[PDB]
């Protein structure tokens, strides 16, 4: 499956 870039990091 596709792995996308993170655009909003976890806290």
């Amino acid at each position, epitope marked *: *499956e*596709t*792995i*996308y*870039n*993170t*655009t*909003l*990091k*976890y*806290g």
Partner: antibody
Amino acid sequence: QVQLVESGGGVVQPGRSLRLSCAASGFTFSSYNMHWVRQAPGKGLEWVAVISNDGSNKYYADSVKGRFTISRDNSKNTLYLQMNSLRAEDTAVYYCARDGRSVGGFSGILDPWGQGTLVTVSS
Amino acid sequence: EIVLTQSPATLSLSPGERATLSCRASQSVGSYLAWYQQKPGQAPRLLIYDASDRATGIPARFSGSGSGTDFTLTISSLEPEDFAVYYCQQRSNWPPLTFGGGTKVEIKR
């Protein structure tokens, strides 16, 4: 075989409350962040809220802040949207959507989407 | 928030014709721009992500291009099932995640 099935929509009076559910199957629900998006009759798409895989990080559209709460029960493969103080303008089909997998946070890719559940705010 | 503007609001074309849809962002979103299709009576479906990458199982007639503030979705030859509404969506700067207002592709006569 990834499937999302919303339920709970119905008629609710202005100022009252309603909880929506989204039942996930065909994937490891606890691994994914989840979104709610809504679509008023004849209108476009409006993002509502997101919750992290583990439930600890939550964000909301300005229009529902202080009124809506997103939550999840990973043991039951279920996503919730608690809607309080409902307004006529909250009338919409509500979709749950899976956040695309990424490392260290949210992707903001919505795939797939459920079939939606209709909320009608009316007296 | 990032405002996405889609033009034209309606595209009137015949099956087999090429369709070009536009999305413009109020500031640069890099390449973080996706396209969803919404067929009548159905939920939206991811078509293109990161401006130009086709989602799984999306036919080759769909393509996208662009970066910064200007993006296009192209359907090289419309099929009957392609007459639908298309939304762009940015994930560069959020919350909120924002969508364009949608472009309807209708049958010309």
